[PDB]
Amino acid sequence: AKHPVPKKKTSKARRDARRSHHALTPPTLVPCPECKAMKPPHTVCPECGYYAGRKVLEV
Amino acid sequence: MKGILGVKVGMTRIFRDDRAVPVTVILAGPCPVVQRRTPEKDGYTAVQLGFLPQNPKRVNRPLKGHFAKAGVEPVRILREIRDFNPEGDTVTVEIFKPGERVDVTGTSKGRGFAGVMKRWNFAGGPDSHGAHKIHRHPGSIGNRKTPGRVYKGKKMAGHYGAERVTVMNLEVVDVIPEENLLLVKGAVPGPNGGLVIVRETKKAA
């Protein structure tokens, strides 16, 4: 409701052209050593836990 | 024209003939020439120099061990010297004697996204009186309907610093070969630790 304001409705081709980078990237995961589940690396596997400092395992 | 690579160690003041300072210690360690570019093959004249050793096999396969001097390929093989063809093997540091004038090229410290008036020394606004939110702004950036655009070099804000800077005609105060040390007169760019190269000056020689 004030100073600078869009001159011309941005066309469909141009709106969609700026969303050419709006794409999401899939989460990056790896097989879990013990259980066969998938886990984002460097995270404590919820199911199994680390060798040493406690898993706090679902057990 | 003799050149060599190095790191910036640090700065200190020195005393000679009562007058004191100032110096930037830079170790210009041994550079083993890894390649020697020639007008018959490359069409110009230079020498790849290769710097700090290390690399317990982080070296890929192109490596270029080739020239039997690749004594565990260096980290910074970066940069030749151009119109330089040394003793064929290992550019020591004794190439510069004290009294000589030199040119250090380094990479300036990076200020990141910097406003005009740091980027460019602009005057900004009044700190008071009329004020209104422009205390550090660039003022006007042009004319009106003609030319009706902004010039193609207009000094504005942006990523200032973190770039190639060469300061010339630096004096060599002393060289210490036992430790591959080289000394000059302050003006040298880059942070401590940075790669810098050192040439003899374009002033003459």
């Binding site: - | 790191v7 160690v9 640090g10 200190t12 003041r13 020195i14 005393f15 009562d18 004191a20 110096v23 210690v25 170790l27 700090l52 210490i176 430790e179 040390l181 000394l183 401590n192 630790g193």
Partner: protein, 137 residues
């Protein structure tokens, strides 16, 4: 490379070791080399030491005297070759590092605020008499 400072510490072979230990608050006379036209005469500056900013070599300290109704401060490199010598004239109780405050009371309040450092005084002499008793052979 891993010695970035030990490297710097190496050029600093200009280090001086003859000069006396001293800390701010105590007054010291520093014999200084001066040119004075072509020649070279040894001028003395005698005042209260008022600040020591240490940085290894290229540490500086500053001394302060009132001369001919005007205050003067001089700033010396602790390892300046020009320092002929430097010798303490009285040991004063500091109670603070940088004591710039005395710039604003150069009078009677300047003493009694910087009183005698008995403990450091009674070393300085008794600490010498033993060094006088040694090497009399």
């Amino acid at each position: 490379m891993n010695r970035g400072a030990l490297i710097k510490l190496v050029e600093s072979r200009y280090v001086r070791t003859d000069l006396p230990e001293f800390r701010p608050g105590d007054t010291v006379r520093v014999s200084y080399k001066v040119k004075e036209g072509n020649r070279t005469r040894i001028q003395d500056f005698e005042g209260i030491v008022i600040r020591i900013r240490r940085n290894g070599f290229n540490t500086t300290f500053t001394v302060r005297k009132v001369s001919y109704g005007v205050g003067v401060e001089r700033i010396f490199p602790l390892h300046s070759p020009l320092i002929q010598k430097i010798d303490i004239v009285q040991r004063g109780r500091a109670r603070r590092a940088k004591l710039y405050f005395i710039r604003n009371l150069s009078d009677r309040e300047i003493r009694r605020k910087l009183r005698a450092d008995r403990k450091r005084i009674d070393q300085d002499r008794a600490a010498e008499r033993a060094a006088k008793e040694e090497a009399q052979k």
